Amino acid sequence: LLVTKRDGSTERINLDKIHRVLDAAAEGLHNVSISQVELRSHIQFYDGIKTSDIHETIIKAAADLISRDAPDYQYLAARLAIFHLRKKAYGQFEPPALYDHVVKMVEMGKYDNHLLEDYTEEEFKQMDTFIDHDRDMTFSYAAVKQLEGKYLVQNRVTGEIYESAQFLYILVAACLFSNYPRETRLQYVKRFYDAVSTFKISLPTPIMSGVRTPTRQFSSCVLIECGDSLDSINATSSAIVKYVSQRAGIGINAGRIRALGSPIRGGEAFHTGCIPFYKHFQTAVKSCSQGGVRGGAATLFYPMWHLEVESLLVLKNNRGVEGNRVRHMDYGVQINKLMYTRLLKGEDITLFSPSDVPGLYDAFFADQEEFERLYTKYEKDDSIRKQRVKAVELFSLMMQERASTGRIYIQNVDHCNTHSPFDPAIAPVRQSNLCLEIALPTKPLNDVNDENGEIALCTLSAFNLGAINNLDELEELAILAVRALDALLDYQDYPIPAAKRGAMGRRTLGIGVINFAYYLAKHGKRYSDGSANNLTHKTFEAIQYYLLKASNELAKEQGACPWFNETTYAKGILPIDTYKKDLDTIANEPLHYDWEALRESIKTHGLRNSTLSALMPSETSSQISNATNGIEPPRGYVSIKASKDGILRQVVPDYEHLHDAYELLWEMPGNDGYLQLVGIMQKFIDQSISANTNYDPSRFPSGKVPMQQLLKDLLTAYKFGVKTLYYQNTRD
Amino acid sequence: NLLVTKRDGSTERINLDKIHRVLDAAAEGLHNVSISQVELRSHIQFYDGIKTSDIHETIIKAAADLISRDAPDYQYLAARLAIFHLRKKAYGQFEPPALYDHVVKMVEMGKYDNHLLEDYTEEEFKQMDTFIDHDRDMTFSYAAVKQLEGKYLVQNRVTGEIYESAQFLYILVAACLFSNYPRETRLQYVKRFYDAVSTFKISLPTPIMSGVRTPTRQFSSCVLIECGDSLDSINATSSAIVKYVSQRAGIGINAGRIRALGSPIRGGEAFHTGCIPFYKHFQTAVKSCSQGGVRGGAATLFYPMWHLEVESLLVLKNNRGVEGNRVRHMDYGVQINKLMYTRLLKGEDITLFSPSDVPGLYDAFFADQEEFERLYTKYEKDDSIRKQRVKAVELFSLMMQERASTGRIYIQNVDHCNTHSPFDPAIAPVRQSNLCLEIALPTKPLNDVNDENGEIALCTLSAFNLGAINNLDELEELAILAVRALDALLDYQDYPIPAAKRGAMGRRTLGIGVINFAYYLAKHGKRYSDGSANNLTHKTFEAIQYYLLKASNELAKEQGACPWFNETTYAKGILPIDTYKKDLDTIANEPLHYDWEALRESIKTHGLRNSTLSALMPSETSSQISNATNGIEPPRGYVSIKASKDGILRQVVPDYEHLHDAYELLWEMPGNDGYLQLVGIMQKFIDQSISANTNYDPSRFPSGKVPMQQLLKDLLTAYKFGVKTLYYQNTRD
Numbered sequence A: 001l002l003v004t005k006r007d008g009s010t011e012r013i014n015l016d017k018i019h020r021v022l023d024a025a026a027e028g029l030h031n032v033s034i035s036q037v038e039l040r041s042h043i044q045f046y047d048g049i050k051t052s053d054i055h056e057t058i059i060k061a062a063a064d065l066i067s068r069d070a071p072d073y074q075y076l077a078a079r080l081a082i083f084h085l086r087k088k089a090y091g092q093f094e095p096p097a098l099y100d101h102v103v104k105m106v107e108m109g110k111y112d113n114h115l116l117e118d119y120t121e122e123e124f125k126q127m128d129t130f131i132d133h134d135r136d137m138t139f140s141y142a143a144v145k146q147l148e149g150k151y152l153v154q155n156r157v158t159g160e161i162y163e164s165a166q167f168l169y170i171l172v173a174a175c176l177f178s179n180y181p182r183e184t185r186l187q188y189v190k191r192f193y194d195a196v197s198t199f200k201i202s203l204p205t206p207i208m209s210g211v212r213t214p215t216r217q218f219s220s221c222v223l224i225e226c227g228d229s230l231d232s233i234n235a236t237s238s239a240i241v242k243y244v245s246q247r248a249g250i251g252i253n254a255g256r257i258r259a260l261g262s263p264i265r266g267g268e269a270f271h272t273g274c275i276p277f278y279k280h281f282q283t284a285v286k287s288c289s290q291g292g293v294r295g296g297a298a299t300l301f302y303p304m305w306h307l308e309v310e311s312l313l314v315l316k317n318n319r320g321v322e323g324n325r326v327r328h329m330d331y332g333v334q335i336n337k338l339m340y341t342r343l344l345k346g347e348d349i350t351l352f353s354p355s356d357v358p359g360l361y362d363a364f365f366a367d368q369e370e371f372e373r374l375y376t377k378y379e380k381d382d383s384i385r386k387q388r389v390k391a392v393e394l395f396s397l398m399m400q401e402r403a404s405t406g407r408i409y410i411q412n413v414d415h416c417n418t419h420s421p422f423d424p425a426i427a428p429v430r431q432s433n434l435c436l437e438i439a440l441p442t443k444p445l446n447d448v449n450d451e452n453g454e455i456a457l458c459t460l461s462a463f464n465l466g467a468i469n470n471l472d473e474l475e476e477l478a479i480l481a482v483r484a485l486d487a488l489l490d491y492q493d494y495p496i497p498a499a500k501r502g503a504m505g506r507r508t509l510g511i512g513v514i515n516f517a518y519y520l521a522k523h524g525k526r527y528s529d530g531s532a533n534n535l536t537h538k539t540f541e542a543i544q545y546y547l548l549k550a551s552n553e554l555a556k557e558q559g560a561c562p563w564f565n566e567t568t569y570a571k572g573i574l575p576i577d578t579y580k581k582d583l584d585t586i587a588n589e590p591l592h593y594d595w596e597a598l599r600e601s602i603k604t605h606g607l608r609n610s611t612l613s614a615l616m617p618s619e620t621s622s623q624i625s626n627a628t629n630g631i632e633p634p635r636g637y638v639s640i641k642a643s644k645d646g647i648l649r650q651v652v653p654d655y656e657h658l659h660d661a662y663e664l665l666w667e668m669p670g671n672d673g674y675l676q677l678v679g680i681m682q683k684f685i686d687q688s689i690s691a692n693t694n695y696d697p698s699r700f701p702s703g704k705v706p707m708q709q710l711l712k713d714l715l716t717a718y719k720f721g722v723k724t725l726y727y728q729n730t731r732d
Numbered sequence B: 001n002l003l004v005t006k007r008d009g010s011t012e013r014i015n016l017d018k019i020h021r022v023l024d025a026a027a028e029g030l031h032n033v034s035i036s037q038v039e040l041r042s043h044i045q046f047y048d049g050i051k052t053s054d055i056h057e058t059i060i061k062a063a064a065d066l067i068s069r070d071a072p073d074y075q076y077l078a079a080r081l082a083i084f085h086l087r088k089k090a091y092g093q094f095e096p097p098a099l100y101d102h103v104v105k106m107v108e109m110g111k112y113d114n115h116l117l118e119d120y121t122e123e124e125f126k127q128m129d130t131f132i133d134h135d136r137d138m139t140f141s142y143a144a145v146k147q148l149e150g151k152y153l154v155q156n157r158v159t160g161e162i163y164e165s166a167q168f169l170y171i172l173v174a175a176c177l178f179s180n181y182p183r184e185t186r187l188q189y190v191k192r193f194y195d196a197v198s199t200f201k202i203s204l205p206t207p208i209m210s211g212v213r214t215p216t217r218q219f220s221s222c223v224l225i226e227c228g229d230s231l232d233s234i235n236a237t238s239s240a241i242v243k244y245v246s247q248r249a250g251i252g253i254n255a256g257r258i259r260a261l262g263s264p265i266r267g268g269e270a271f272h273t274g275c276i277p278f279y280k281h282f283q284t285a286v287k288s289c290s291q292g293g294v295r296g297g298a299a300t301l302f303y304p305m306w307h308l309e310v311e312s313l314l315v316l317k318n319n320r321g322v323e324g325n326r327v328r329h330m331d332y333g334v335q336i337n338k339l340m341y342t343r344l345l346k347g348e349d350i351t352l353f354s355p356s357d358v359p360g361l362y363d364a365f366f367a368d369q370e371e372f373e374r375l376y377t378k379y380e381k382d383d384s385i386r387k388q389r390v391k392a393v394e395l396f397s398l399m400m401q402e403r404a405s406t407g408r409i410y411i412q413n414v415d416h417c418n419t420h421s422p423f424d425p426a427i428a429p430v431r432q433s434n435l436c437l438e439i440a441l442p443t444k445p446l447n448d449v450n451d452e453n454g455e456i457a458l459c460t461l462s463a464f465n466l467g468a469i470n471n472l473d474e475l476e477e478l479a480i481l482a483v484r485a486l487d488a489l490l491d492y493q494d495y496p497i498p499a500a501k502r503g504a505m506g507r508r509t510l511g512i513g514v515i516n517f518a519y520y521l522a523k524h525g526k527r528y529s530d531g532s533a534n535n536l537t538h539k540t541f542e543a544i545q546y547y548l549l550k551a552s553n554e555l556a557k558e559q560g561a562c563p564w565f566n567e568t569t570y571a572k573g574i575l576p577i578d579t580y581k582k583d584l585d586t587i588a589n590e591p592l593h594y595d596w597e598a599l600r601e602s603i604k605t606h607g608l609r610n611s612t613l614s615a616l617m618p619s620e621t622s623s624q625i626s627n628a629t630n631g632i633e634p635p636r637g638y639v640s641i642k643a644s645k646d647g648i649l650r651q652v653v654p655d656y657e658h659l660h661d662a663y664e665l666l667w668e669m670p671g672n673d674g675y676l677q678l679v680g681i682m683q684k685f686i687d688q689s690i691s692a693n694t695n696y697d698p699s700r701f702p703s704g705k706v707p708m709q710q711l712l713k714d715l716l717t718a719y720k721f722g723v724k725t726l727y728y729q730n731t732r733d
C-alpha cells in the first residue's frame, strides 16, 4: 500500500494520481480504455515500489495494447513515455527557458559554444516563442524509442536524458541558419523548425543527433574510386579507414584494377589477382568494427566484361574456401546496352582486362557508341588476351548469386550518363554508394592527401508525402530543405582534402521521400495495377521543379557552384529532355509547371547544387514521422520489433480509414507494377533510386523462382530506364 | 639400330660412345662412381626417334638417383652433366664466349644493365675475362646447380631460355658493386671478390645473386616497420608494407604501441575496437601481392608481454576459435624482459597494462630496466589505472603452449637487445626485429607513407662459409671484401619509401652471418650438446667480429663514418666484449686472441662505416649453393631428400666419407642445453641477433608428450646466457 517517491520519501498509494495521468495521455484518442491499462498495471504493483517503476509499468501496459483494432495506443504509450522523459531531464513537465537550457548545457559540454556567440540572449527569447512543446504528443511509440535511443542528447554512461524533442528541432535549425544575416535569420529558423517538427521534412540520423553538439562529423555517404596502382590502392585503403572511423558508408570502384596474370612494367612481374586486394579493402572497412560482425558496410563495383567476373560474382556465397571468398562486403555489377543485346540475341560476351583494352573502360561510361566500336574491335583482335562466355550463362550466374545472397546489385551505367545532370565528357559517373541511390563523379587518388583526386560526398534528406495536403507546399519546403543542407556543407568537416574538393566544388545534395505507400493509399492508388503511374509523374514533377527552383533562386543570392560548368544544366539540359522514351507508353500525364522559364533561369544564373534529388532507404528517420520505409510497401499493417525495453509495435498511418487502401509487400503479383513506378520517378530524379525486387517462392510452381522470371524483370527494369537495383527480398 | 634426333631436327645412328665420352669428362677426379651403372639404367629407357636433349636429361636423372651415403660423389657427377647442358642452352657450345662479347649481346637484349658498358671499357672487360675460371662450374653440387638454373641464373621466365653461366654471374656481380671504385684499385677488388664468391668463401643472398647486373634495383629483403598508436600511422604502416611485400621482402611489424580494446579516444569521444581488427588489416597488406595469399610475403608481428590483450594475441595462430579472433597467416614475437622472468621464478603475478595508460612504461621497457621496475610497481599500486592481474606461471604457460602447437610464436628478450647492443638505448633503442628474428635495428613510426621523420630499418645480409676456409685469419681478407661490397650496394639499390632511405643512409646497417657451422665442428671433432665446442666457438666468432669491425673501421678512414655513428655505443668506445652476459664466463674460458684495445682507440677516432655488421640468419637457399649445412643449425640427416619439379633432389652432407661419425644429427641430440650455450657464446660478439631454434623429440619423453617444465627450463636457460631471440620450435613427428 506504499510507493517510493523520487527523493526517497514514502506515501500511501493513490490510484487517482495514476488515473489522472492516463487521462492526459488519452486526449483525442479513440477506442482506448483507461481501465484496461489500470487492470494490467495494478496487478503488478508491490509494496515499496519506486514511482519511476510505476510510470514505466503503465507505459509497457499501454504499449502491449497496440494493435490493428486500436491503433491509437501507439500514441497513448508514446505520450506516457514523453511524460517520463520530461522528468528525467528537467525534473518537471514543462521545459525550462531556451536560453537557460543552452547556457547550462554549454557548461556541461553537451552543446557547442558557438550557439551563444551567434545568438544573443534576446534572440533566444524570440526563438523560444516558436517552440510548441505539445507537438511531442504527435510522436508514435516507436518514434519515442528512436528519439530516446539515437537522437536525444544523453549521457552514454549513466543513461541520463538531457533534452527533449522540440529543443532538438529548434537548435538544429538554429545551427544551420546561424550564419544567415539577422535580417532573415530568425525568419528562416521558425519556418525550418515548423517543417521538421510537423514531420514535413525528415533529417538523417547524424544530423538529428549531431547539429548542435561540438562534433562536426556529419558525412554518412562516401564514394571512392580506386586506380590501377599500388599508390592508389594504398591511398584508397587509407581513405576508407578515415571514413569508417566516422561511421560512414563506403562506395568502392575497383573495376580499374587489372586482372590476374596481367604483366607489370612490361613483364617485370605478373599480377596476383583482384581478390587479394578486395580482402585488403574489407579489412580497411572493418578496421574500426568490434570483431567482424556489423560495423562499417561497403559496396564494391566492377564491370561485367571484366576478366575475373566469374570469380567476383561468387565471393559472397557460404560455400568454398576463404581463398576465393570475400563475404563481408556487397557487390554491384555494372551493365550497359551492349551486354543486354548479347543476352537477347543469345550470343557471347567477351571478357577483357582493363589494362589490355585501351580506352575501352572510359568509353564504357561516357560513350556507348564509342564503346561498341572498341568492344567489337578488340573482339576480332587475337593479340589481346580474352575469354569467351555465353551471355545467357553469364547473366544467369549473376542473378543466381543475387537470389541466394540478396546483396548482389545491378547498375546500368549507360542510363547513369545518358540521363544525368553531369557531362560524361567532363565528369562521368562510374560508380555508386552503399545503398545505390547516389550517382556522383569521382577521381582516383595517388595519395591519401592528394588534392587532385575527388571523393564524392552527399548530404541526405527526405520529404514526407503524408504530411502535405497538396503538391504546392513543396515550393516552401524545397527552399527550406536546400538552404539548410547547403549550409551544412560549410558547417561539417572533411578528413580528406580530396573529399572537400568534391563537396565544395559541386555542392551535391540528395533529397528523397518517405511515406509513399501511405501517399498512394490516400489517393486510392496501388503498386501492381499501375493506377498510380500518372499520379507518380505529377508528384515527382513538382518535387524536381521546386527543388531546382529553390536551388536556382539560391544561386541568384550566393552564386552558383564552382563546378557548375561541368553539369548538363549549364548547357540548358533538363531531366525532362534525356529521360527514357519508353516511359511515354506507360504514362501520359502532362507537365504542370513552367520548365521552359526554369531552363532559361538556370542557363543564366545557374544552380547552387549540381544534384538535388535522390531516393534513399529510410528505416530510422521514417519511424520518427511514423512513415512507411521510403518508397517500399510495408510487409504488414503492424511491424513487430523486439527491443531492450520489450516488444515495440508500430501501426501504419491512418489504418482506421485505409486498411483496405494499403497494398502489402506479399500481396503483390509481381515486380512489373513496382518497377514501372520506379522508372517514372527516375524521369525527374537526378541521381538513382534504391529499388528493391521481391519474390514469393510460394507463388511459383515447385516452390522455386525460375531463372526466366529473374531475367524478365531485369530486362523490364532496364527498358524503363531504371538505373540501379538494390535488395532482392525472398519470403521465408 | 636405333636412331636419335639432333637439335636441328636431323637424325643419326645411335652412338653409345658419344654418351660414354661425355660421362668420362664429368667423372674426372671423382671416386666410387660407376659409368657402366649409369649407362645400364639409361640405355634401357632409350627409344627410336628420341630427342638428343631428352638423352642428356636422362643420364642426369639416372646419375642423380645414384646419390647415396656410400657414393656421395654422384652429386658432383650429375651436377657437371647439368652444367654441360646449361652451357649448350645459353651459348650453343661448351666453352663460353668472350666476356665483352657476352655483355654487349645481353645489354642489347635488355637483360643486363647498360651502365656496365658505361663504367667499363672494352680493354677492362678483357682483363676481367682472364680472372674467370669456367672450370669452377664443375665444383657445384647437384642441388646447387638446380638452384642456379631455377633462381640465380638470368633467364626468360616465359620460354625458359637460359642466357648465362655460373661464372658470368659471379664476375658481373663483382663488376657492378665495385663499378664506382677508382681505377687504381677497381679491377683489383673485382678479382678478389670474384675469387671469394666463386670459391664459395662468401655467400650472397638470392636478390643479390639474381639481381646485381640486371636493370632492376630491388635488393631490399629485410624490412622493419614500427607502427604508432594513430590512424595516420596505421594507414602509413599498411601502405609501407604493401610496397615492400610487392618487392618480395620480409616484414617486421611493431604494433605494441597500439592501445588496448576499450581505451578512450579523444577524451571519450569514441572507444577503441581492439588491436585484432588492425592486425587483420596488416595481414591483408602483407598478403596483398600473393597468388592466393600463401607463397608471397611473410611477416612477424611484435608486442610486449605486459600488454592488456596479450591473452588474446597469444592465441591468434591456433586452428581453434572463430575468424573474429584469429589471425593465422602471420607469425608473432612476444617481448619479455627481466622483470617478467622474475615474477615467473617467484611464482607471483604479472599486471597487464594498456600502453596509452602508462606514461613512459613502454619506453622504459626497452631503454631502462631500472626505470621500468620503478614505474611498473608504481602503476601496479595505482587503482585509477585500468589493469588486469594474471599469474606469471599461467601466462608463460599459455605462450609456450601456442609455441609448441604452432611453432611460430617467438620470444625476444628486449633487455638483452639493448644492454648488449651497438646502439644507445637513450637515443636509438631496439624495439623490434624482423621475419627470422636475427635483425635488431632502431626504428621510428611514420605519420605518413612519405614521412621524412620516420625511420624504417633496412639491412643487407651475407654469410661467411666456415667450411671453405682453412683458418680464421682468412676472414681478414674476406671481411674487407664482404663489407665493402655490401656497403656499395646500399648506394646501388633503390628505396620506395623515404623513411627507409633515411635509416639505410644514416646508419648503413649490415648483417653478415655464417654457414657450414655443423661441418665446421665436424672438422675439428667437436659436438653441440657436450659443450666441447664452447672454446672453439668463442675463438671463431671472435675472429669474425674483430675482422668485421676492423674492415669497417679502415673503410671509415677511407670514405668516412656513417652519419648517425654518434648514436652508437662504438662512438663512446664501447665494445661487445664489455657488455656481454657475465654468465658466459662460467661456460667458456677461451682468451682473446686479437688486439681489441687498439681497435677500440681506432673506432673512437675514425669511427665505423657501418653501425652493425654481424647477424646470424637462416640460410636454406644460399647454403645449398656451397653444399653447406643450413646456417648454424645441425643437419636432420646425412642425406636430405627434397622433391622438386624435375624429380627428387638428393644432397649429401659435406665430406661424409671421412666424417660420418664426426657429425651429430639434430635428433641425435639429448637436449637443447648444449645448443643454447653455443648460441649464447656467439651472441657475445654478434652485433644484432641470432635465429636460434629449439628442438624437441616427443619419443624421448614419457607418455609421448613434452612437459611444460622442460619448455620453461630451456627458456630460462636461453635467457641465462644472454640469448636475444628464439626462432622456430621444431617438433619431430
Ligand SMILES: Nc1nc2c(ncn2[C@@H]2O[C@H](COP(=O)(O)OP(=O)(O)OP(=O)(O)O)[C@@H](O)[C@H]2O)c(=O)[nH]1
Residues within 6 Å of the ligand: A017, A018, A021, A024, A025, A083, A084, A086, A087, A092, A093
Ligand atoms: N500532460 C501533463 N503531464 C503532466 C503535467 N504536470 C505533470 N505531468 C506529468 O505527469 C507525471 C506526474 O506528475 P506530478 O505533477 O508530479 O504528479 P504526481 O506524481 O501524481 O503527484 P505528486 O505526489 O504531487 O508528485 C509526470 O510524468 C509529469 O511529467 C501537466 O500539466 N500535463
Ligand SMILES: Nc1nc2c(ncn2[C@@H]2O[C@H](COP(=O)(O)OP(=O)(O)OP(=O)(O)O)[C@@H](O)[C@H]2O)c(=O)[nH]1
Residues within 6 Å of the ligand: B018, B019, B022, B025, B026, B084, B085, B087, B088, B093, B094, B095
Ligand atoms: N667437359 C667438357 N664438356 C665438353 C667439351 N666439349 C663439349 N662438351 C660438352 O659435351 C656435350 C656434347 O658435346 P658435342 O661437342 O656437341 O659432342 P656430340 O654431341 O657427342 O657430337 P656431335 O654430333 O658432333 O654434336 C655438350 O654438353 C658439350 O657442352 C669439353 O671439352 N669438355
Ligand SMILES: Nc1ncnc2c1ncn2[C@H]1C[C@H](O)[C@@H](COP(=O)(O)OP(=O)(O)OP(=O)(O)O)O1
Residues within 6 Å of the ligand: A003, A004, A005, A006, A007, A011, A012, A013, A014, A015, A017, A018, A021, A051, A052, A054, A055, A087, A091
Ligand atoms: N502516491 C502515488 N501513488 C501511486 N502512483 C503515484 C503516486 N505519486 C505519483 N504516482 C505516479 C504518477 C506517475 O504516473 C508516476 C511517476 O510520477 P513522478 O511525478 O515522476 O514521481 P514522484 O511524484 O515520486 O516525484 P516528483 O516529486 O518529481 O513529482 O507515478
Ligand SMILES: Nc1ncnc2c1ncn2[C@H]1C[C@H](O)[C@@H](COP(=O)(O)OP(=O)(O)OP(=O)(O)O)O1
Residues within 6 Å of the ligand: A228, A229, A230, A231, A257, A258, A263, A264, A265, A266, A269, A270, A271, A272, B245, B246, B247, B248, B288, B289, B290
Ligand atoms: N609485386 C607485385 N605483385 C603483385 N601485384 C603487384 C605487384 N606490384 C604491383 N602489383 C599490382 C598493383 C597494381 O594493380 C598493378 C601494378 O600497378 P602500378 O603500382 O602502377 O605499377 P607500375 O606503375 O610500376 O607498373 P605498370 O606500368 O604495370 O602500371 O599490379
Ligand SMILES: Nc1ncnc2c1ncn2[C@H]1C[C@H](O)[C@@H](COP(=O)(O)OP(=O)(O)OP(=O)(O)O)O1
Residues within 6 Å of the ligand: B004, B005, B006, B007, B008, B012, B013, B014, B015, B016, B018, B019, B022, B052, B053, B055, B056, B088, B092
Ligand atoms: N649421335 C648421338 N647418339 C647418341 N647420343 C648423342 C649423339 N650425339 C650427341 N649425343 C649426346 C651427347 C650429349 O650427352 C647429349 C646432348 O648432345 P648435344 O651436343 O647437346 O646435342 P646435339 O649434338 O644434337 O646438337 P649440337 O649440334 O648443338 O651439338 O646427346
Ligand SMILES: Nc1ncnc2c1ncn2[C@H]1C[C@H](O)[C@@H](COP(=O)(O)OP(=O)(O)OP(=O)(O)O)O1
Residues within 6 Å of the ligand: A244, A245, A246, A288, A289, B229, B230, B231, B232, B258, B259, B264, B265, B266, B267, B270, B271, B272, B273
Ligand atoms: N572511430 C574509431 N573507432 C575505433 N578505433 C578508432 C577510431 N578512431 C581512431 N581509432 C583508433 C586508432 C588509434 O589506434 C586510436 C586513436 O588514436 P588517433 O588515431 O591518433 O586519434 P586522435 O589523435 O584523434 O585521438 P587520441 O588523443 O586518442 O590519440 O584508436
Ligand SMILES: [Mg+2]
Residues within 6 Å of the ligand: none
Ligand atoms: Mg510527482
Ligand SMILES: [Mg+2]
Residues within 6 Å of the ligand: A228, A229
Ligand atoms: Mg602503373
Ligand SMILES: [Mg+2]
Residues within 6 Å of the ligand: none
Ligand atoms: Mg652435340
Ligand SMILES: [Mg+2]
Residues within 6 Å of the ligand: B229, B230
Ligand atoms: Mg592521436
